Structure 1
Amino acid sequence: DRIDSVSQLQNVAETTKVLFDVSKETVELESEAFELKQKVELAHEAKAVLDS
């Protein structure tokens, strides 16, 4: 029974560290995307005023 618990934990220890890195890394890229959003926004507004 004890062996069963242990075997799970071995594989976990490495692979979980991968996810740890991965999650924060994606979030960083997504931060940079906000600057893109601002490009989208200003242009949309400009077309609208001009249409009026």
Structure 2
Amino acid sequence: DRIDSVSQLQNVAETTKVLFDVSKETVELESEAFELKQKVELAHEAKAVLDS
């Protein structure tokens, strides 16, 4: 039974490193379009005033 328990995570821990790696960027890489959000909302009011 302990053969299976050890073999459950024989391949997991090293494959979780790239998992832990990429998950960090994919979470904390949302700032570039956050600034684009600032200019996208800047565009809407620019359209809004001229439409007004």
TM-score when normalising by structure 1:
0.84
Gaps in structure 1 of 5+ consecutive residues? none
Q: Which runs of structure 1 show a deviation greater than 6 angstroms over 4 or more consecutive aligned residues?
A: none
What's the CA shift string for 1:16-46, capped at 9, x where partnerless? 1111111111123212220111111101111
Q: Percent identity?
A: 100
Gaps in structure 2 of 5+ consecutive residues? none
For the aligned residue pairs, the C-alpha RMSD in angstroms reads 1.1
TM-score when normalising by structure 2:
0.84
